Write a protein that binds this ligand. Structure first.
Ligand code: SAH
Ligand code: SAH
Lengths: 275, 158, 273, 161
C-alpha cells in the first residue's frame, strides 16, 4: 500500500525452450530487467540467442544451478518453467513416472523455486508458473499439486488458437483461471495458419494416417511456418541454426502456446514497468 | 539457547520406530516423535501424501528429520525437510539423516548429494546428514546410534 | 517513334528455379502481365508458387514445350533462362559437355527463344537473357556464343554482394556491360549477412567454415545465404525442406542484385507501378 | 511458282559431296552446293564452327539441307542450327526440304530428342532417317541408294537435266 515507481521484471526461466516467456513478456510491453534461462538443447539456445539479441543469460543444465547461484543472481520476480514430459505422458508405455527418469527434473523446479521465493516477512510481489501435460498419471498430478501447494488450472490452446493443446498450469499468477479472451489476432482455424495455395482438412490440429493439408492434387503435412502460426509464434521464428525440418518440428512440439502464455502473463502489467 | 530441551523428531524412515529406539538407546529425552511412511506425544500419521506443510507447522517445531530405508522416498523426505527447516534467521539446532543402500544408481547418488548439499558416509549403506562427524568430502540400528551420538550434546538427556 | 501506353511485361522463364526473375521484376516496379515458368524441381516450384501467390503459370519440363505452345501462350516480351551447369563446369570431372548430359538443355532454350522471337518486320521490343557459369570449357563457351550470336558479359556478384559468383550473361538487354551501381541496399560484407552474435571469417563467401559463434566455428545458415545472394530473409523457408535442400536451391540461384542490374533498363519499355 | 529451277543444297553431312552424288544420280540440276563438316559455285567451307547466320544468308537461299553420318548430339545440333538459319521465313511458302541420317544404335533419349526437335518421327531402314520429304512422314513409334529412294520426290520440285 506504499508508492514506488514500477520496476522492470526479473525472470528465472527453467527449461526455457525457445524463450516463449521472454517473447510473451516483450509482446505485453513489460520491461525486462534480466532474463536468466536454464536450457540444454543447443538448437533452442541458438533460437533464443538470435531472436532476442543476446539478452538471455544462459546457465545450462538446471541441475548445475545451486541455491547460492539463485541468491547471487537474484532477486527474481518471476520464476517460470515447463519440465520435460516424456516420462509423465501416459502415451509412453516406457514412462518412468514423476520420480524417475526425466520426470524428477520437476523437483529441480521445486528446488530452485524454494531457493528463489522471498524470505518470510518480505511482501514484495513474486510469481511462479509450472506447466506440464494433462495426459499424465493421476498420481503424478496429485503429487505435483502436493509439492507445489496448488491445484492446477487446465487451459487448452484450442480456445485461442488452431491447436489441440490441453495443459496443466500450476502457479500463483493473478487470475489464472479467469476466462480467456478471444481477440482479433487469434487464428482460431487451421486454414488461417496455412501458406498460400493450401487448404485445411480440419479446423484444429492434433499432436496417424492424417496429412492435415491439401495442396493442389496431393496430400501434405504441416510446414514449420504454418506450425509457428498454429502455436502463435512469429513466422520464421524458428528459422535459425541450420536444423532439419524434423528438429524444428520437435522444438515447436515441446513449446508453449503463445496466446495461452500471453493470457497467463497479462496481469503482470499491473506489477512491473511497461514500455 | 537457555538450556537443553528434549528433542522433537519427524520420521519418514522405513520403520516407524527405528529412530525412537535409537534415541532412547542414547538416553535422549523426546518431547515429540511423529512417524510417516511412503506407501503407494508420539503418533503415527499414515501416508506421507496426507501430510501437508500446515501439518508440519502445527505439529512442529521439529529438531530432527530422518528418512530412508536399509528411490522416490528421497523426494518426500526432501519435501518434509524443506517444510520443517527453521526459517532464515533462526539459528536453533536442526539436524537430519537420510539412509539408503549403496547399490543405487550413480545418478541417484549424485542427485541426492546435490539436493542435500552433502556427500554421503559410506559404511553396505550410504548415510547423508549434517550431524558433526557426517561432514564428508568428495539391522541398521547401531550404526545410526553411532552417527546420532552428537545429538547428546544438543538436547536434554535423562 | 510512335506513341502508345506502356503495357505490362510478358515473361517466359525457363529453368526458373526459385523465381528470381519475377522477384526482381516486382522489385523494380515493373508491372508483370504474365509469367510462364518451366521448372521440374518441386521444391523450387513450391517456393515460387507460395512466394508469388499463384501468379506463376508452371508448365513443367522445358522439353514438353512446343512451338505451338509458345505461339498460343505468347506473345512474350522477355525470355530468360539459366540452364543446369553440372555438365558444363570444369570442376566436375564426369562432365558430359554442352552437347550431352544436362548440357544439351541449353539447346531447348535456343529452341524456344527462336520460337518466341518476333517475326520479321515486327519492331516490337523483345529481350532475352541466358546465364551460365564462367568455369566451363572454352569450346563450350565458344559454341554457346556461336548459337546465340552474342558474346557474353562477365558479371561477378562479389561487386554488389558478399558472394564470389562470376557468371556469363548472353543477351540483348540494354546496356548489360555498363558499370554496376553499388547502392545502399547492397551488403558487400559477409558480416552484414550474418545473424546476431556471429562473426565473419572472410569478407566474401566463396561457395570452409565461414563464421564464428561464441567459441565454435560454424557454417553459413540459409537465412544468411539468402542475405548473401540478395534474397529476402526466409524467402526459401517453405515446403519443409532439409537444410541441404535449401542450400541446393540457393546455390543454383541467380544473384538478386546482379539480375536487378541487368533488368533495370526494362523500366523504359514497360508499364511501371 | 513460275517454273522449276535447279536445286540449292547445304550439306553438313559426314561424308562430303554424298548429296551431290545422289542428286546427280537422280538427274537434278544443281545451282549451288555448300558443304561443311563438324570436325572437333560448289564449295567446301570447312569447320561448321566458322559458318554464321550471315554466311548462310549470303550463300543462300537454300532449298535442301542435309546432315548426319552413316556422342550423336553435336552433329545433330549443328545441323539443327543450320536448318534454322537456312529455313524460309514465315510467309515464304517456297519448297524447302531437309534430311538427317544417323545410326540406329543411339540412346533412346537421343532419338526422342531428335524427333522432338525436328517434329518428325524417324524412318527406319540399319539406320534412322528424319526428313520432311513426301514419304518420310511417319507415325509414332512403338551406301547411298537409300538416300536415292528418299530423295526421289525432289525431282518433282526442282529442275531436272
Ligand atoms: N537438465 C535440463 N536442464 C535444463 N533444461 C532441460 C534439461 N533437460 C531438458 N531440458 C529442456 O527442457 C525443455 C522442456 S520443453 C519446454 C519448452 C518451453 N516451455 C518453450 O515454450 O519453448 C526442453 O527444451 C529441454 O531441452
Ligand atoms: N528439364 C528441365 N526442364 C525445366 N527445368 C529444369 C530441367 N532440368 C533442370 N531444370 C531446372 O533448371 C534450374 C537450373 S539452376 C537456375 C535457377 C534459377 N536461375 C534461379 O535463380 O533460381 C534448376 O532449378 C533445375 O531444377
Amino acid at each position: 500500500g506504499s508508492a514506488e515507481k514500477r520496476k522492470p521484471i526479473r525472470v528465472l526461466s527453467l527449461f526455457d525452450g525457445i524463450a516463449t516467456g521472454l517473447l510473451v513478456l516483450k509482446d505485453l510491453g513489460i520491461q525486462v530487467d534480466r532474463y536468466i534461462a536454464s536450457e540444454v538443447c543447443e538448437d533452442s539456445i541458438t533460437v533464443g540467442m538470435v531472436r532476442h539479441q543476446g539478452k538471455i543469460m544462459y546457465v545450462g543444465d538446471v541441475r548445475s544451478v545451486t541455491q547460492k547461484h539463485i541468491q547471487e543472481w537474484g532477486p527474481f520476480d518471476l520464476v517460470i518453467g515447463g519440465s520435460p514430459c516424456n516420462d509423465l505422458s501416459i502415451v509412453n508405455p516406457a514412462r518412468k513416472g514423476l520420480y524417475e527418469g526425466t520426470g524428477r527434473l520437476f523437483f529441480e523446479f521445486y528446488r530452485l523455486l524454494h531457493d528463489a521465493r522471498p524470505k518470510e516477512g518480505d511482501d514484495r510481489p513474486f510469481f511462479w508458473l509450472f506447466e506440464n501435460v494433462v495426459a499424465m498419471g493421476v498420481s503424478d498430478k496429485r503429487d505435483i499439486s502436493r509439492f507445489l501447494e496448488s491445484n492446477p488450472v487446465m487451459i487448452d490452446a484450442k480456445e485461442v488458437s488452431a491447436a489441440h493443446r490441453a495443459r496443466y498450469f500450476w502457479g500463483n499468477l493473478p487470475g489464472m483461471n479467469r476466462p480467456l479472451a478471444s481477440t482479433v489476432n487469434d487464428k482460431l482455424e487451421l486454414q488461417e495458419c496455412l501458406e498460400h495455395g493450401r487448404i485445411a482438412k480440419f479446423s484444429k490440429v492434433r499432436t496417424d494416417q492424417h496429412f492435415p493439408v491439401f495442396m493442389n492434387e496431393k496430400e501434405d503435412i504441416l510446414w514449420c511456418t504454418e506450425m509457428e502460426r498454429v502455436f502463435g509464434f512469429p513466422v520464421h521464428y524458428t528459422d535459425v541454426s541450420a536444423m532439419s525440418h524434423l528438429a524444428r518440428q520437435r522444438l515447436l512440439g515441446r513449446s508453449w502456446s503463445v496466446p495461452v502464455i500471453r493470457h497467463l502473463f497479462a496481469p503482470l502489467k499491473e506489477y512491473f514497468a511497461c514500455v
